[PDB]
Structures are given as structure tokens and as C-alpha cells.
Design an enzyme around this catalytic site. Structure first.
Site, PDB file in Angstrom:
ATOM      1  N   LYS A   1      -2.278   4.249   4.291  1.00 21.76           N
ATOM      2  CA  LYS A   1      -3.046   5.182   3.470  1.00 21.76           C
ATOM      3  C   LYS A   1      -2.766   6.649   3.798  1.00 21.76           C
ATOM      4  O   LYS A   1      -2.745   7.500   2.898  1.00 21.76           O
ATOM      5  CB  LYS A   1      -4.543   4.885   3.522  1.00 21.76           C
ATOM      6  CG  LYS A   1      -4.915   3.535   2.875  1.00 21.76           C
ATOM      7  CD  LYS A   1      -4.507   3.494   1.416  1.00 21.76           C
ATOM      8  CE  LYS A   1      -4.933   2.200   0.769  1.00 21.76           C
ATOM      9  NZ  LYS A   1      -4.887   2.293  -0.719  1.00 21.76           N
TER      10      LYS A   1
ATOM     11  N   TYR B   1      -3.273  -0.647   8.078  1.00 20.99           N
ATOM     12  CA  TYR B   1      -3.911  -0.251   6.814  1.00 20.99           C
ATOM     13  C   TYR B   1      -4.141   1.252   6.745  1.00 20.99           C
ATOM     14  O   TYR B   1      -3.788   1.900   5.760  1.00 20.99           O
ATOM     15  CB  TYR B   1      -5.263  -0.966   6.625  1.00 20.99           C
ATOM     16  CG  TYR B   1      -6.016  -0.521   5.370  1.00 20.99           C
ATOM     17  CD1 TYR B   1      -5.784  -1.146   4.156  1.00 20.99           C
ATOM     18  CD2 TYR B   1      -6.963   0.501   5.414  1.00 20.99           C
ATOM     19  CE1 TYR B   1      -6.463  -0.777   2.994  1.00 20.99           C
ATOM     20  CE2 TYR B   1      -7.658   0.885   4.248  1.00 20.99           C
ATOM     21  CZ  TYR B   1      -7.382   0.244   3.043  1.00 20.99           C
ATOM     22  OH  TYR B   1      -8.036   0.576   1.871  1.00 20.99           O
TER      23      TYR B   1
ATOM     24  N   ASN C   1       0.778  -1.226   0.000  1.00 18.63           N
ATOM     25  CA  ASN C   1       0.000   0.000   0.000  1.00 18.63           C
ATOM     26  C   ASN C   1       0.823   1.298   0.000  1.00 18.63           C
ATOM     27  O   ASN C   1       0.322   2.333  -0.439  1.00 18.63           O
ATOM     28  CB  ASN C   1      -0.927   0.046   1.221  1.00 18.63           C
ATOM     29  CG  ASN C   1      -1.982  -1.036   1.222  1.00 18.63           C
ATOM     30  OD1 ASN C   1      -2.012  -1.908   0.348  1.00 18.63           O
ATOM     31  ND2 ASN C   1      -2.848  -1.004   2.240  1.00 18.63           N
TER      32      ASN C   1
ATOM     33  N   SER D   1      -7.222   6.583   0.150  1.00 16.29           N
ATOM     34  CA  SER D   1      -8.376   6.148   0.942  1.00 16.29           C
ATOM     35  C   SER D   1      -8.793   7.226   1.917  1.00 16.29           C
ATOM     36  O   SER D   1      -7.951   7.930   2.481  1.00 16.29           O
ATOM     37  CB  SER D   1      -8.027   4.871   1.730  1.00 16.29           C
ATOM     38  OG  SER D   1      -9.050   4.509   2.647  1.00 16.29           O
TER      39      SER D   1
HETATM   40  N1  LIG Z   1     -13.201  -1.097  -1.123  1.00 19.13           N
HETATM   41  C1  LIG Z   1     -13.128   0.010  -0.369  1.00 19.13           C
HETATM   42  O1  LIG Z   1     -14.038   0.304   0.400  1.00 19.13           O
HETATM   43  C2  LIG Z   1     -11.940   0.951  -0.476  1.00 19.13           C
HETATM   44  C3  LIG Z   1     -11.996   2.192   0.172  1.00 19.13           C
HETATM   45  C4  LIG Z   1     -10.930   3.077   0.090  1.00 19.13           C
HETATM   46  C5  LIG Z   1      -9.817   2.712  -0.657  1.00 19.13           C
HETATM   47  N2  LIG Z   1      -9.768   1.521  -1.280  1.00 19.13           N
HETATM   48  C6  LIG Z   1      -8.553   1.239  -2.048  1.00 19.13           C
HETATM   49  O2  LIG Z   1      -8.845   1.040  -3.438  1.00 19.13           O
HETATM   50  C7  LIG Z   1      -7.943   0.082  -4.002  1.00 19.13           C
HETATM   51  C8  LIG Z   1      -8.712  -1.080  -4.641  1.00 19.13           C
HETATM   52  O3  LIG Z   1      -9.419  -1.814  -3.635  1.00 19.13           O
HETATM   53  P1  LIG Z   1     -10.667  -2.782  -3.931  1.00 19.13           P
HETATM   54  O4  LIG Z   1     -11.742  -2.378  -2.962  1.00 19.13           O
HETATM   55  O5  LIG Z   1     -11.004  -2.711  -5.418  1.00 19.13           O
HETATM   56  O6  LIG Z   1     -10.111  -4.216  -3.455  1.00 19.13           O
HETATM   57  P2  LIG Z   1      -9.811  -5.559  -4.300  1.00 19.13           P
HETATM   58  O7  LIG Z   1      -9.131  -6.541  -3.385  1.00 19.13           O
HETATM   59  O8  LIG Z   1     -11.071  -5.963  -5.062  1.00 19.13           O
HETATM   60  O9  LIG Z   1      -8.712  -5.134  -5.379  1.00 19.13           O
HETATM   61  C9  LIG Z   1      -7.406  -4.785  -4.945  1.00 19.13           C
HETATM   62  C10 LIG Z   1      -6.559  -4.547  -6.177  1.00 19.13           C
HETATM   63  O10 LIG Z   1      -5.213  -4.375  -5.736  1.00 19.13           O
HETATM   64  C11 LIG Z   1      -4.388  -5.342  -6.389  1.00 19.13           C
HETATM   65  N3  LIG Z   1      -3.177  -5.808  -5.673  1.00 19.13           N
HETATM   66  C12 LIG Z   1      -3.124  -6.332  -4.428  1.00 19.13           C
HETATM   67  N4  LIG Z   1      -1.841  -6.674  -4.145  1.00 19.13           N
HETATM   68  C13 LIG Z   1      -1.101  -6.377  -5.241  1.00 19.13           C
HETATM   69  C14 LIG Z   1       0.253  -6.502  -5.536  1.00 19.13           C
HETATM   70  N5  LIG Z   1       1.084  -7.038  -4.608  1.00 19.13           N
HETATM   71  N6  LIG Z   1       0.718  -6.096  -6.754  1.00 19.13           N
HETATM   72  C15 LIG Z   1      -0.119  -5.570  -7.667  1.00 19.13           C
HETATM   73  N7  LIG Z   1      -1.438  -5.442  -7.414  1.00 19.13           N
HETATM   74  C16 LIG Z   1      -1.947  -5.838  -6.201  1.00 19.13           C
HETATM   75  C17 LIG Z   1      -5.322  -6.515  -6.646  1.00 19.13           C
HETATM   76  O11 LIG Z   1      -4.787  -7.416  -7.618  1.00 19.13           O
HETATM   77  C18 LIG Z   1      -6.571  -5.775  -7.083  1.00 19.13           C
HETATM   78  O12 LIG Z   1      -6.434  -5.335  -8.441  1.00 19.13           O
HETATM   79  C19 LIG Z   1      -7.033  -0.332  -2.865  1.00 19.13           C
HETATM   80  O13 LIG Z   1      -5.909   0.560  -2.844  1.00 19.13           O
HETATM   81  C20 LIG Z   1      -7.837  -0.037  -1.622  1.00 19.13           C
HETATM   82  O14 LIG Z   1      -6.990   0.170  -0.494  1.00 19.13           O
HETATM   83  C21 LIG Z   1     -10.796   0.638  -1.220  1.00 19.13           C
END
Ligand SMILES: NC(=O)c1ccc[n+]([C@@H]2O[C@H](COP(=O)([O-])OP(=O)(O)OC[C@H]3O[C@@H](n4cnc5c(N)ncnc54)[C@H](O)[C@@H]3O)[C@@H](O)[C@H]2O)c1
Ligand SMILES: NC(=O)c1ccc[n+]([C@@H]2O[C@H](COP(=O)([O-])OP(=O)(O)OC[C@H]3O[C@@H](n4cnc5c(N)ncnc54)[C@H](O)[C@@H]3O)[C@@H](O)[C@H]2O)c1
Lengths: 254, 254
Positions: free
Chosen positions: A155, A151, A107, A138
Site C-alpha cells: 500500500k 500488505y 495490490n 490505504s
Molecule cells: N476494508 C478495509 O478496512 C480497507 C482499508 C483500507 C483499504 N482497503 C482497500 O480497499 C480495497 C477493497 O477492499 P475490501 O475491504 O472491499 O475487501 P474485499 O475482499 O471485500 O474486496 C476486495 C476486492 O478486490 C478484488 N480482488 C482481489 N483479488 C483480485 C484480483 N486478483 N483481480 C481482480 N480483483 C481482485 C475482489 O474481487 C474484491 O472486489 C482493497 O484494495 C483494500 O486493500 C480496505
């Protein structure tokens, strides 16, 4: 920003938010859309291609935790083919406060490293044309989910780092902004681990409040990209798009 | 909070800010002062021991970048001898944006990992008495020095992590607050590297603006420790002590 005819690299495009953002991105007539993600997704890839046959979509297996040298090598291959890249969009993220080192590695450190790598091609001081970086951070980087303190801390790091990238634009030629989703219904928040198991029901509790769909987030994400505002801190929460103002607590005078 | 008869562990007690804080601490009549630092400084050790021969001072050669199991091993050594520890101060930190991984490992991951390790001895859920953590973060964690974006992001991380620790106190029994010095004249800021050499004169420039001495910092550091306010975000800038209020941009509702 007009996305018509642009070249875009999207690290982690096939996740929850990622795929819905990608679905929206390819509705624009992009020239090239290059996906960098851990694991292939044939189904997702075929669907994106179907949405807009005019866009050349390519995929590379990519893990953000590799050394900076290995990232540059991949990027060189891409820049050698495309000659120009307009936007880099980072999304990589895990949520698992049982995995301290890995959470930080993915992250925070991985994001910094991909940025540092692409600067080799974009830095105007090295003869580069400049560029745009969109970093998925985030809302937890503004105010934590204190039950996932690691986490949330990773962020807060990338919100800061993005803010600094933007202030460095006049020097590097690379502008940047953060994309900060609120709680969004994806496999990230369905089941997850709290630090030292401080709240074993954290996911259940979080999702017992308002959320947005990844569809709504994707829509506002591409909207923010088209606005193209250096130093923007975008909040994408409850299906809205909103810029926040960072509080001045201190100043280095430089 | 009365420091008289208290047992204190200070990670990185012998650096610039650390030594002058350690002087102010030993004058407060502690029972035991346990120093964890990367390298010996016999001169500083000898001196501290002399300021109050009453106080029992020990030293362990310790690097914050070891795994949490290794940290737990040293802490077991310490808890088995002292029986109780009242306060942990996490003060380890480097400033060198040519060292991305190490900056992150030391300033962020290391602090989280020592915290995680000591929680095994303090967590009320595990039969422990609770405790107090004082984390040395930085004003750069509120607003970056954007020429050292990695350092500053690593500090934003620990400000956040400390904020979350404090909110977890009703669960763990471990209270926490951050100590955020402004620019302070130590070997840290003598001279140092900017990220991608964006500003080779960063130290010269920074130091042409107002600073404080490590003595001023150290005196205000003990004052905040004595204040013992859970969740406080202390600003120790230009010889003053100030609690700052963190902006509410978002709420998890949990
Ligand atoms: N879902 C939420 O509520 C939320 C809220 C705020 C921020 N986010 C952020 O948005 C982003 C996407 O999250 P999401 O909700 O779609 O989750 P998700 O688990 O569906 O997708 C996560 C993405 O990150 C990729 N990833 C994880 N480890 C990796 C690595 N080592 N190398 C390359 N890619 C990697 C995964 O392959 C996937 O494409 C993340 O940064 C997450 O922290 C999500
Ligand atoms: N000097 C400033 O202006 C300033 C401002 C804000 C915050 N800080 C922070 O205050 C703290 C002390 O810095 P300082 O100004 O005294 O600098 P310093 O370089 O004099 O002291 C650094 C301390 O960290 C320890 N350390 C470094 N790496 C370590 C490791 N891997 N394992 C264990 N210990 C390690 C050193 O041994 C030393 O005790 C740091 O966290 C620094 O980031 C300093």
C-alpha cells in the site's frame, strides 16, 4: 466533476467497499459503468442495475495478476465499444501476509500494470485524450499495520505510485488521486493472516477500535471522485473525507 | 555497536555502494564476511580479502528473486558453518522502469523474502537469538523521482516494510533500520530508463544536480550500522548522515 453521462471502469467493484461505492456511483446518471472483477456476482449486478435503469452496466471477468498484454486486450474491447472512457477506478486488494508474492502481485504490480495498459489508450503522446485514475490505496500506506508488514508495504508502494502518476499528468494527460480508507467493516478485515503469525489475533484487535461502515466509505469515495483533484491523497476514515499533505523529505530537482 | 568479531551477511556487497561499504566494514575487524551477489567480481573479492587478511570472506552466487525455500537452503549452509550471524544487509536493487515486474521482484519482494528466510534462523519464537537487519532503501521511498515511479514505489514499500520490522522486534528479536542514500555516483545511475519513456534524459538531468560519491555513502553507512538504532530511518544524502522523522498520518491503535 459531473458524473452525469460519464463512462467509468471499476476494477474490483463488487467487493465490500467496491459494492457500496458502486451503489453510490450508479445513483449518478452515468452513461456506462463497466465492472472488472475476479468472480461474477449476479445478485450484486442485478441490484446495481435496479438502482438506476438509465445506466448501462456491464461486467467482465478479470484478474489483475495477468500480464500487461492481456489487460490491454480487454481494455481495447471496452474502448472499441465505448469509444471514450472517463475514469478508471482500481480497488483490487487482498490482505493475507501468508501470501507474500500474491499480495505484492495484486495490490502493487497489478495496479501498476492496469495503469500502464490504459495509458496506451489515454497517453496524449500516443494520440490519446487523457483520463483520470482513482487508486484505492490505504491508510496503511502512510503508516503501517506493522503486524501485516507486507500488505502495508504494498500500500505504501501504491500511494507513492499514485503521487507520481499525478506529477506526470502534464506529460501523459492522465491525472490521478489515491483513495485511502481507514478501517472499514468488510470481509477483508473479518479474519486475516499476520506475517510469520506475529499476531494471530490481529483482526480481533484491529476491530476492537473505531471503524466505519462500507456505506460511509462509499459515500465519501464518490464525493472524492466528484472533487476530481489531481494529486489528492484522500483519507476516508471514521466516516469523514479529508485530504492529507505529503511531507517533503527530499527532492530530485527535476 | 562494535563490529569487532561480528559475522555479517551482505546481499549485493560488490556493487557501487556495496563495495565501498564493504571496504569500510572489513576495516572494522569482522570475524566472517559473507557475500551474496548475483555475479562474481574476482577483482573486488581479491581486493577486500587483502584489506584485512584476518577477516574471513566467502562468496556465494545468489539471486534475490528465487523462492524463499531456495534462500533458506543457502542460509542453512551458512548458519551451519558460522553457527551465528549478527547482521544481515539487504542491498540488492535495479533501476530500470522498463522492467516493471523485475524491479518489483528485486527491490521489494526479494528483500522481504530474504528477511522472511533469515527469520527462520533468528526468530526468538523458534529458539533463535534474534538479529539485526540493515535494509538499503532510498530517499525515493520518501519522495519519488516521479519519472521512475515503479522504482520509487518499490522503495516506498521497503521503507515501510523496514519500519514495521523494527516495531516487530519485541516479538521476533530481530531489530531493523533503513539506509536511504540520496543520489550516489554508481553504475545504477550512469544511465537508466524512465517509465513509458516519460523522460529519456532522466539520468543526464538528475546528474546535473548535486550528488555524493560511493565512498562518502559507504563511510556513513558503517557509521549508521555502528549506531545500531532500531527503527531508525537513516538519510545518507550529500555526504551527511541524518535520521529523519516519519509523519504520523494515521494510527492502527494496535
Ligand atoms: N476494508 C478495509 O478496512 C480497507 C482499508 C483500507 C483499504 N482497503 C482497500 O480497499 C480495497 C477493497 O477492499 P475490501 O475491504 O472491499 O475487501 P474485499 O475482499 O471485500 O474486496 C476486495 C476486492 O478486490 C478484488 N480482488 C482481489 N483479488 C483480485 C484480483 N486478483 N483481480 C481482480 N480483483 C481482485 C475482489 O474481487 C474484491 O472486489 C482493497 O484494495 C483494500 O486493500 C480496505
Ligand atoms: N546510486 C544511488 O544513487 C542510490 C540511491 C538510493 C538507493 N540506492 C540503492 O542502493 C543499492 C545499491 O545500488 P548501487 O547504486 O550500488 O547500484 P549498482 O547497480 O552498482 O549495484 C546493484 C547491486 O545489486 C545487486 N543485484 C542486482 N540484482 C540482483 C539480484 N537479482 N539478486 C542479487 N543481487 C542483485 C548487484 O549485483 C549489485 O551488487 C540498491 O538497492 C539501490 O536501489 C542507490
Amino acid at each position: 466533476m459531473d458524473l452525469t453521462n460519464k463512462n467509468v471502469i471499476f476494477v474490483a467493484a463488487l467487493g465490500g467497499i467496491g459494492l457500496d461505492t458502486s451503489r453510490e456511483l450508479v445513483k449518478r446518471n452515468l452513461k456506462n459503468f463497466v465492472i472488472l472483477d475476479r468472480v461474477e456476482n449476479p445478485t450484486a449486478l442485478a441490484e446495481l442495475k435496479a438502482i438506476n435503469p438509465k445506466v448501462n452496466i456491464t461486467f467482465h471477468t478479470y484478474d489483475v495478476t495477468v500480464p500487461v498484454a492481456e489487460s490491454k486486450k480487454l481494455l481495447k474491447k471496452i474502448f472499441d465499444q465505448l469509444k471514450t472512457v472517463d475514469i478508471l477506478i482500481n480497488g483490487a486488494g487482498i490482505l493475507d501476509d501468508h501470501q507474500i508474492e500474491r499480495t505484492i502481485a495484486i495490490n502493487f504490480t497489478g495496479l501498476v500494470n492496469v495503469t500502464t495498459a490504459i495509458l496506451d489508450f489515454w497517453d496524449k503522446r500516443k494520440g490519446g485524450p487523457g483520463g483520470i485514475i482513482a487508486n484505492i490505496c490505504s491508510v496503511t500506506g502512510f503508516n503501517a499495520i506493522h503486524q501485516v508488514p507486507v500488505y502495508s508495504a504494498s500500500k505504501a508502494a501504491v500511494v507513492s505510485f499514485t503521487n507520481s502518476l499525478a506529477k506526470l499528468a502534464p506529460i501523459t494527460g492522465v491525472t490521478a488521486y489515491s483513495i485511502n480508507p481507514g478501517i472499514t467493516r468488510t470481509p477483508l478485515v473479518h479474519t486475516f493472516n499476520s506475517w510469520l503469525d506475529v499476531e494471530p489475533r490481529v483482526a480481533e484487535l484491529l476491530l476492537s477500535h473505531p471503524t466505519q461502515t462500507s456505506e460511509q466509505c462509499g459515500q465519501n469515495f464518490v464525493k472524492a471522485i466528484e472533487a476530481n483533484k489531481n494529486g489528492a491523497i484522500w483519507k476516508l476514515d471514521l466516516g469523514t473525507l479529508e485530504a492529507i499533505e505529503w511531507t517533503k523529505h527530499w527532492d530530485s530537482h527535476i
